[PDB]
Amino acid sequence: VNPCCYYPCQHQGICVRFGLDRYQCDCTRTGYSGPNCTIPEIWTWLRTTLRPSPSFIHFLLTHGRWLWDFVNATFIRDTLMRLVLTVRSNLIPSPPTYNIAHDYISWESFSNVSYYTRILPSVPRDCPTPMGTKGKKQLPDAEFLSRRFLLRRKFIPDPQGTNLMFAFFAQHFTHQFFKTSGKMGPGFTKALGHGVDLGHIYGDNLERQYQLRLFKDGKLKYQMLNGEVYPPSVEEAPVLMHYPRGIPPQSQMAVGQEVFGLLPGLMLYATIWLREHNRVCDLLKAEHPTWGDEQLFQTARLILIGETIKIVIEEYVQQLSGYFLQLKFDPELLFGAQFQYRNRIAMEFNQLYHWHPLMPDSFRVGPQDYSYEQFLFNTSMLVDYGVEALVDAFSRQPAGRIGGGRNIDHHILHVAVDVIKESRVLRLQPFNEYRKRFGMKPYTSFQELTGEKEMAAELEELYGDIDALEFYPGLLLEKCHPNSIFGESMIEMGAPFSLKGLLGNPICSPEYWKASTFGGEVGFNLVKTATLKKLVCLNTKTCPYVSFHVP
Amino acid sequence: VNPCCYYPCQHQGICVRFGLDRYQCDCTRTGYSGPNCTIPEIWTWLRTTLRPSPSFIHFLLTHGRWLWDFVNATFIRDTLMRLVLTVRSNLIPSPPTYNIAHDYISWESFSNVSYYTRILPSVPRDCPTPMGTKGKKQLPDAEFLSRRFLLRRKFIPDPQGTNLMFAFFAQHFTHQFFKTSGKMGPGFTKALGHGVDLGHIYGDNLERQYQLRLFKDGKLKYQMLNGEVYPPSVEEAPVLMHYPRGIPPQSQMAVGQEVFGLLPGLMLYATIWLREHNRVCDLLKAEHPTWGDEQLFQTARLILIGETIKIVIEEYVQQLSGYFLQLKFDPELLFGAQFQYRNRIAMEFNQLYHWHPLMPDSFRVGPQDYSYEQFLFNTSMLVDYGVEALVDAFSRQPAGRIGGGRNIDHHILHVAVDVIKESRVLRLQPFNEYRKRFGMKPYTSFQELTGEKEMAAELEELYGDIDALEFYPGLLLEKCHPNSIFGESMIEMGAPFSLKGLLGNPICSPEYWKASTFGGEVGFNLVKTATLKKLVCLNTKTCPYVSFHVP
Ligand code: HEM
Ligand code: HEM
Ligand SMILES: CCCCCCCCO[C@@H]1O[C@H](CO)[C@@H](O)[C@H](O)[C@H]1O
Ligand SMILES: CCCCCCCCO[C@@H]1O[C@H](CO)[C@@H](O)[C@H](O)[C@H]1O
Ligand SMILES: CCCCCCCCO[C@@H]1O[C@H](CO)[C@@H](O)[C@H](O)[C@H]1O
Ligand SMILES: COC(=O)[C@@H](C)c1ccc(-c2ccccc2)c(F)c1
Ligand SMILES: COC(=O)[C@@H](C)c1ccc(-c2ccccc2)c(F)c1
């Protein structure tokens, strides 16, 4: 039996097959030695004995508001934001390592940007069980597992107050770097760029971007409807959009991401950002009359990328974490650190980010209450209400809690089933192996995992062993922190991917983070002072209630 | 007139247009402040005044063998090597900045790997002169300029003793990252990868790599001739190769780099390396009897990348530099530094690397003295003599001095004329500007550039102003260090590009630089101990005289 199936190497040691039956762990720079990289160096031992529980730190960050107020107003804020940025980042390998084709480092894996990368290699195709060594010869039926533990019975709003304005932002934002290729198969992506390159706005390819661009003042094409600015029609922007058969070109909206027409919430942001881009082009042209269309367009793109990162860290993530510590976006915090300004999206981060529980039972807009059937392929709800209105509505409707289980609307539950099935195609390692890879102790039992005893008993029966529990179900069924939107694992595993993804962008490098990169002090401040409110209200007639938090 | 034409911004400050006539320098992190970034900070000032000239350091590095030997045996060697690696590297922007289309940072320039990057923005198109503000409205005829100061009259051997073996290595080695696309035009490359990825061995695209691979024991396809191993024919490896019309397929060899069939010298190295790949495969298989073709192929490739970088730094550059300090390839030297493990090829680096003066008047193989018309497309010379034979030949024949002028054989002189013509197309800034960008004061007169009077006087009449002298012309006409192969500019401008490209390779990052990456201690040692002599001799029937220095 393949020795590596036992996942013998600890602390990121790499398992290597030798001869016909031997194995050997490369423990280079892991802080440990020994056949399995478990004998700690004095310093490694000091660090792990002094480190407080991921649950205890959470406590410190969610208590003593008075304390954090003085802290947030002093340089201590910075010191902490950096501490967070680096410790969280060092958990993500850079350059990237493995992919669906290679469970080992290779030039193909490093250069071939069409692949999704992965943090932990796969379960060797020749292991006793699908998960390696533990569990039954067969995993629970994905559909059954979903229906029994992920299907929503009664809507459970997010205790942290997260609304749908946040939910859709999350969907919009992530579908710029999560674009699995149906033609190539799981493990493959079209979102080359692997990060916040705003490809869901400008397109994952040049010819497409060229088709979306107006080529005047560096602006994006658009149309007027009811006196408001909206994306252009596919007739005007000859770009492929995924719409139900029968909808003519003149009735489709072109935006950058082919799937965005399938949701008013999505096209909402599509519209907001489009307006923002063209607005920045104006401010720019004013400052640089000698500039052509290209430099205006390119410069505006950089500024928007900046706004995006700015808002994701200081508002998006702030809402998610619920920390009293005010997160800060300032690339300079890493200028004294050893940091690689690059990033590659991981399949695990893709799985982890399936936050479908956020979606409501139905979408309420004013006195109206739309169902999924009326909301999904709606070709006019956006224009009927206009930007402001939909923003006020989504900002007021609570989103569902992500963790704790049984909170995915049946209308979209199929996604979860597919997420599970794919997981097995990708052969993602067990949840406990990932708990460890991200600095956490593995769960010793399902009751430990689920703060309760009922689902724990059933899960125990289905899987047989806690060590057989799969990645996604684990994230979604883990017991949640007090009044949190999810559990610690979603935080301890998600944080490193996110922050690496935000700071691992070239505009955050010393070489790029210059005023001149954004066309001057003017463009640099738009990035530095970006706000969800400003993003909406500076592109709308009236300013509605806009926030990632419900009033 | 456009203010940026005056290259007003010093010390890497960025010139930016404001209004219809104003400008502004972005001095961020330049060590200077003030309108043109001329006001030195306290530490900046010390460094620049207490820094010995390049000329003086070169003196220290080529005298006192006795002291250097004692140094090479101490930790000081690592200290100096590291200094050399970091100081030299910091001169290269990473992430990359501009390209043939954007004289400013942009997401297209950062993402579009099909472009060559550039270190100085082009000469603004609306400037008074072709070079900006100095010189005549019309630059010297490229053909005349070439015939007057670059055409060889009497072969001038390189005093440092460099031979053709070194000459062909350089060509072979560089042609893996210098692959300008004729279809796309100047400023564009086909060598994505932008570095030492060995695309000249495995191809620069996957489908091509596949046709070249045997898919057995991770090996490359090959054919037998006279009991010796040679690259396959285009009939067995249906891969594009540039050969004159009329040459049957059975006579065309397939090598990954479409242009190597054009020189026994190139095809020789293609053979040597191809033989080394399969050799490394046999070694890996012995250690990992359970591996398959893909992993064997990938691991071998990484090992060869490592070997190439080892040989380039410790032998190739050692020979070039002429330094008594013993250069050293060891990634650990940078583990405590802030350094990006990425690299993008610059057009200036391409221009600078046109070392055609290395080629002789003819090619001496034993008693026979083959001419250019007998050598150029000979498809049967390599096989006629075999590897040992040609390696011995090229190792014994001196290559010509790269600097000094009048030393390029008429047979290939058209190449220099075209480099000059392309420079103007790329609108490369003036030589003195590049001198400054690389820490050197500009030459104040042609007589100061060339250590003589005659050529100087004529260049003065042609260019009219030292500030109009172009990039390539300057590098080749600059006076040479004592008995060196070329001038300081070639070293001071080429060292940063080179080392950044070698060390800025993913295998040199803490993440990849582990024994497991190379198949274990066996693979790693093949890298840690690679030699030009072992590369050849461990793959030939008999070991000839092999070296980069003539006997
Ligand atoms: C109107 C509510 C939503 C619907 C109808 C929906 C639908 C879908 C569908 C059909 C897929 C692809 C399924 C497949 O290929 O089998 C998908 C993927 C995904 N969804 Fe949603 N989704 C919704 C909301 C969300 C939200 C709020 C998020 C959280 C940011 C989200 C994140 C994702 C992710 C990360 C993927 C995988 C992307 C990829 O691999 O390309 N979805 N969703
Ligand atoms: C055997 C004698 C040589 C011949 C016949 C030769 C021929 C050529 C030709 C025809 C081109 C393309 C010219 C064009 O497109 O106008 C070229 C480009 C080049 N050669 Fe050579 N060359 C020789 C030796 C060398 C050597 C010794 C070096 C030194 C490394 C060298 C470096 C280059 C470089 C850097 C380029 C440009 C790369 C690119 O843009 O793709 N060549 N050479
Ligand atoms: C108030 C102090 C805040 C310090 C912020 C540090 C950033 C959090 O860092 C995280 O802490 C976890 C808990 O031990 C670890 O398990 C994770 O590996 C680590 O990345
Ligand atoms: C105690 C040592 C004092 C050294 C005085 C050095 C002064 C350099 O002075 C600088 O020279 C530049 C170029 O000429 C100017 O452009 C700057 O404005 C000027 O401040
Ligand atoms: C004897 C000690 C030698 C140390 C080698 C240092 C590496 C050379 O470094 C170079 O020196 C030049 C001359 O000042 C500078 O102009 C260059 O910017 C710098 O990179
Ligand atoms: C960095 O550590 C942290 O606790 C905070 C700042 C943090 C950072 C990022 C996330 C996060 C997790 C999953 C998806 C998106 C963002 C998160 F939930 C918390
Ligand atoms: C780093 O500074 C140095 O003087 C040494 C080590 C050095 C390093 C690299 C080069 C070099 C220059 C042009 C093309 C290839 C190599 C060179 F000519 C000298």
Coordinates of C-alpha atoms in Angstrom, one line a residue, chain A residues 14 16-20 26 28-29 93-97 102 104-108 110 112 193 196-197 206 287-291 294-295 298-299 301-302 305 332 334-342 505-507 509-517 519-520, chain B residues 14 16-20 26 28-29 93-97 102-108 110 112 193 196-197 206 287-291 294-295 298-299 301-302 305 334-342 505-507 509-517 519-520:
Chain A
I14 CA 6.6 16.6 1.4
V16 CA 8.1 11.2 -1.7
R17 CA 7.8 7.7 -3.0
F18 CA 11.1 5.8 -3.1
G19 CA 11.9 2.4 -4.6
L20 CA 8.8 0.1 -4.8
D26 CA 11.5 16.2 2.7
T28 CA 13.3 21.2 4.5
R29 CA 12.6 24.5 6.4
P93 CA 2.9 28.8 -1.2
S94 CA 4.3 31.3 -3.6
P95 CA 5.3 30.4 -6.4
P96 CA 2.4 27.9 -6.6
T97 CA 3.0 24.2 -6.2
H102 CA 0.9 17.1 -11.0
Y104 CA 4.6 17.6 -7.5
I105 CA 6.5 20.8 -8.5
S106 CA 7.0 21.2 -12.2
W107 CA 7.6 23.8 -14.9
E108 CA 4.3 23.0 -16.5
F110 CA 4.4 26.9 -12.8
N112 CA 0.6 26.8 -17.2
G193 CA -5.2 36.6 -14.1
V196 CA -8.4 41.0 -8.7
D197 CA -7.7 41.9 -12.3
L206 CA -8.2 41.1 -25.2
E287 CA -5.9 66.1 -15.4
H288 CA -4.2 64.9 -18.6
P289 CA -5.5 66.4 -21.8
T290 CA -2.5 65.0 -23.8
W291 CA -3.5 61.4 -22.9
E294 CA -5.3 53.7 -24.2
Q295 CA -3.5 55.4 -21.3
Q298 CA -5.4 51.4 -18.7
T299 CA -4.9 54.0 -16.0
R301 CA -8.4 50.1 -14.9
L302 CA -5.6 50.3 -12.4
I305 CA -8.5 47.5 -9.2
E332 CA 3.4 49.8 2.4
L334 CA 4.6 44.9 3.5
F335 CA 7.5 46.9 2.1
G336 CA 9.8 45.7 4.9
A337 CA 8.7 42.1 4.5
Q338 CA 9.7 39.2 2.2
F339 CA 6.6 38.9 0.0
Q340 CA 6.0 37.6 -3.5
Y341 CA 3.6 40.0 -5.4
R342 CA 1.9 37.2 -7.3
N505 CA -1.5 41.9 -6.8
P506 CA 1.3 43.8 -8.6
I507 CA -0.3 47.2 -7.9
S509 CA 4.3 46.2 -5.1
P510 CA 6.8 49.0 -4.3
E511 CA 7.4 49.2 -8.1
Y512 CA 3.7 50.0 -8.8
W513 CA 2.4 51.7 -5.6
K514 CA 3.4 55.1 -6.9
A515 CA 1.1 58.1 -7.5
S516 CA 2.3 58.2 -11.2
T517 CA 1.0 54.7 -11.6
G519 CA -2.1 59.3 -13.2
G520 CA -1.2 61.4 -10.2
Chain B
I14 CA 8.9 59.1 -13.5
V16 CA 4.3 62.5 -16.2
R17 CA 2.4 64.9 -18.5
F18 CA 0.0 67.4 -16.9
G19 CA -2.0 70.0 -18.8
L20 CA -0.8 70.7 -22.4
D26 CA 7.3 61.0 -9.4
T28 CA 8.8 58.0 -4.9
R29 CA 11.5 55.9 -3.3
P93 CA 12.1 46.6 -12.0
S94 CA 10.0 43.6 -10.8
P95 CA 7.1 43.4 -11.5
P96 CA 7.9 44.7 -15.0
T97 CA 7.0 48.2 -16.1
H102 CA 2.7 51.4 -22.9
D103 CA 5.3 53.9 -21.7
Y104 CA 3.6 53.6 -18.3
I105 CA 2.5 50.9 -15.9
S106 CA -0.7 49.1 -16.9
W107 CA -2.5 45.8 -16.3
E108 CA -2.1 44.9 -20.0
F110 CA 1.9 43.3 -16.5
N112 CA 0.5 40.3 -21.6
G193 CA 8.6 31.9 -20.1
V196 CA 15.8 29.9 -18.3
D197 CA 12.8 27.5 -18.8
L206 CA 2.9 22.3 -25.2
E287 CA 15.5 6.0 -7.6
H288 CA 11.7 6.0 -8.3
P289 CA 10.6 2.7 -9.9
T290 CA 6.9 3.7 -9.3
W291 CA 7.0 7.0 -11.3
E294 CA 5.1 12.7 -16.9
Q295 CA 6.7 13.0 -13.4
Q298 CA 9.0 17.1 -15.4
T299 CA 11.5 16.3 -12.8
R301 CA 13.4 19.2 -16.8
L302 CA 13.7 21.0 -13.5
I305 CA 17.0 24.1 -15.5
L334 CA 18.9 35.4 -1.2
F335 CA 16.6 33.7 1.3
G336 CA 17.2 36.5 3.8
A337 CA 16.5 39.2 1.1
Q338 CA 13.5 40.9 -0.4
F339 CA 13.5 39.6 -3.9
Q340 CA 10.8 38.7 -6.5
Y341 CA 11.2 35.3 -8.0
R342 CA 9.9 36.3 -11.4
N505 CA 13.7 31.8 -11.5
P506 CA 11.0 29.9 -9.5
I507 CA 13.4 27.0 -8.8
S509 CA 12.7 30.3 -4.5
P510 CA 12.6 28.9 -0.9
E511 CA 9.4 26.9 -1.9
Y512 CA 11.0 25.1 -4.9
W513 CA 14.6 24.9 -3.8
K514 CA 14.1 21.6 -1.9
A515 CA 15.6 18.2 -2.7
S516 CA 12.1 16.7 -3.2
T517 CA 11.5 19.0 -6.2
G519 CA 13.6 13.8 -7.1
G520 CA 15.7 13.7 -3.9

